[PDB]
């Protein structure tokens, strides 16, 4: 039994204990006094401020050092008139781990690490009490001892895996979406893709040849999207090595599983809409074979580029939800500049070669509607010419069909319409002289330069309206169809970056009123329907691209490979 040290020590009364237990552990001592804690006057305010500081057991690693500072300031050891101080190695403990009490009330004067209050080389008697309470997580936070998993200050607690906002039973519905919409998909895709090899003699040419790599897009994407379907891949693409959530992944010390899902989806993403651009390229040309390689260059390196890009700056996250791993579901701006701006220019680019292509269709359709229009003006008016008897109206008709020459005329086609003209002139003498009967004759000779050499151009302006009748008109059909999904796509992402701003300030606040506790609500969450929507945007360009080999020729082809 040794005697302590002066410095160590603080003159005071020693009142006996009330209560024989600190923070729930047995305390052996019999006094304590209450000038050590300025807050409390009374050993019955004293627990009730401790009772308060015991809030604090949640967040382990505060919870494990803060228990023996709190019964030492709070409830010490009194003996002979004077009070034990609490040694300064005890106190320097808590501010590393108890910082979140610094910043949420700030730490009270007393208890502040000063050398006076708090001395060096003090021999405690709460260092010898063990203390077993410890390692409570209040959910959505789970355990978890890794600290790059740790939310906020609250050191020893990380966010759980499945996302607070959305119930297990909305987890459920939105699964059940994604296995129905991806498996007709992948179904449908790989159907198409089993039909182009089949008779890939004839298929592996353009433009049949881009509808091919586009489904091939789908397909690989809706491997990524039913990834999370095997047994437990959900809590192995999505969930972390110790139950949290994926967060800034490639991260160090886990598994790459996210990393693949995310490359799989979001490139396949990508290359799908610069195949879509190519594929609205490819319908304002056909108004290529050559141009082969430059095609093949952009679909594949554009998306690995933006995707080795989010790769280098590790903002690939995952969501439960989703049950996926994609490019800033945490940090928005990240999302918008990597998914918002690439489908933003696929919209103008891709959106411009289906105006300038209706813009060529509608052109060349009208350079027929006025050449036939001009066909019957000539045509009316020279069976004007035959019924008429009086100069006057012969004269009258062939200064139409003078002026309806000219701007039928607006080098083969105007050598021709120069002949006719000049024919006119040479009738329109006649009339002027007041001939009727020459006039009349040279009316018909009009006829037979009309019937043998410009008859011809119209014959193969007819054919040529002819030639848009079915493939001219389905590609371009599939090209606005897609386009119409991929305006769709964008709205539903623009949304989220949109709202995303409030929803990180809910979220948060949702997540850190849950952490104590002795009612919660939810602010506002992303809209569900709104991101069912997006798949049904995603998935319906994979079954509507699908609809390309369902001709009647397909099924013959199915026919000839039975046989073999
Ligand atoms: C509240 S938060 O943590 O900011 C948060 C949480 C979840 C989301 C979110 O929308 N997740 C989610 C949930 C479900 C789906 Cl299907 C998707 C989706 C849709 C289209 C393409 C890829 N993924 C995305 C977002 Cl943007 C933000
Ligand atoms: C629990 O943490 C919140 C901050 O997230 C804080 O406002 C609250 O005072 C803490 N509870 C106790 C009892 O200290």
Redesign the pocket.
């Known amino acids: 039994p040794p005697p302590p040290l002066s410095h160590c020590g603080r003159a005071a009364p020693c009142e006996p204990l009330r209560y024989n237990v600190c923070l729930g552990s047995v305390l052996p001592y019999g006094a304590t006094s209450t000038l050590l804690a300025g807050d409390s006057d009374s050993q019955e305010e004293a627990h009730g401020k401790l009772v308060?500081w015991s809030?604090?057991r949640n967040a382990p690693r505060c919870w494990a050092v803060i228990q023996p500072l709190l019964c030492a300031v709070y409830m010490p050891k009194c003996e002979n008139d004077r009070v034990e101080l609490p040694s300064r190695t005890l106190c320097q403990a808590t501010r590393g781990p108890c910082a979140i009490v610094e910043r949420?009330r700030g730490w009270p004067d007393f208890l502040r690490c000063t050398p006076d209050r708090f001395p060096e080389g003090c021999t405690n008697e709460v260092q010898n009490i063990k203390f077993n309470s410890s390692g409570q997580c209040e959910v959505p936070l789970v355990r978890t001892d890794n600290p790059k998993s740790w939310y906020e200050d609250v050191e020893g607690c990380g966010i759980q895996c499945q996302n607070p906002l959305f119930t297990e039973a909305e987890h459920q519905d939105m699964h059940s979406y994604i296995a129905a919409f991806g498996a007709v998909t992948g179904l449908c895709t790989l159907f198409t893709l089993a039909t182009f090899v089949a008779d890939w003699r004839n298929s592996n040419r353009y433009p049949a040849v881009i509808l091919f790599y586009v489904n091939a897009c789908f397909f690989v994407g809706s491997i990524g999207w039913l990834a999370q379907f095997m047994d437990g891949a959900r809590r192995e693409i999505v969930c972390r090595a110790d139950g949290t959530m994926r967060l800034g992944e490639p991260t160090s010390n886990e598994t790459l599983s996210c990393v693949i899902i995310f490359v799989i989806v979001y490139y396949a993403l990508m290359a799908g809409f610069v195949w879509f651009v190519v594929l609205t390229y490819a319908w304002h040309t056909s108004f290529l074979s050559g141009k082969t390689s430059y095609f093949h260059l952009l679909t594949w390196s554009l998306p690995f580029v933006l995707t080795v890009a989010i790769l280098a700056v590790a903002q690939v996250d995952g969501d439960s939800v989703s049950g996926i791993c994609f490019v800033g579901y945490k940090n928005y701006r990240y999302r918008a500049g990597f998914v918002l701006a690439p489908i933003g220019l696929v919209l103008i680019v891709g959106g411009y070669f289906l105006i300038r292509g209706v813009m060529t269709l509608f052109s060349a359709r009208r350079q027929l509607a006025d050449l036939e229009d001009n066909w019957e003006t000539l045509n009316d008016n020279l069976k004007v010419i035959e019924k008429a008897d009086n100069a006057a109206q012969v004269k009258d008709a062939l200064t139409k069909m003078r002026a309806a020459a000219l701007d039928a005329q607006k080098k083969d086609f105007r050598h021709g319409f120069d002949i006719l003209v000049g024919q006119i002139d040479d009738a329109l003498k006649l009339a002027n002289e007041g001939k009727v009967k020459e006039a009349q004759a040279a009316a018909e000779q009009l006829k037979t330069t009309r019937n043998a050499y410009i008859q011809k151009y119209l014959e193969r302006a007819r054919s040529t309206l002819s030639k848009i009748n079915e493939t001219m008109l389905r590609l371009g059909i599939f090209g606005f169809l897609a386009f119409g999904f991929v305006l769709i796509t964008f709205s539903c992402h623009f949304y989220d970056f949109f709202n995303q701003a409030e929803w990180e300030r809910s979220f948060r606040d949702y997540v850190?009123?849950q952490?104590?506790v002795t009612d919660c609500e939810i602010k506002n969450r992303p809209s569900l329907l709104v991101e069912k929507i997006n798949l049904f945007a995603m998935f319906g360009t994979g079954i509507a691209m699908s609809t390309w080999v369902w001709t009647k020729a397909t099924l013959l082809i199915w026919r000839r490979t039975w046989c073999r």
């Open positions: 308060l809030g604090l949420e850190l009123c952490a104590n």
